[PDB]
Design a protein around this ligand. Structure first.
Ligand code: ZN
Length: 30
């Protein structure tokens, strides 16, 4: 078991897919 957590969020995603979208769409400054 290894939680796919976000380095900035501290939130553990149990799925690499949504942890992926969440990490790439984190780039929503504009
Ligand atoms: Zn995040």
């Amino acid at each position: 078991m290894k939680p796919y957590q976000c380095d900035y969020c501290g939130r553990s995603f149990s799925d690499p897919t949504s942890k992926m979208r969440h990490l790439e769409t984190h780039d929503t400054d504009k």
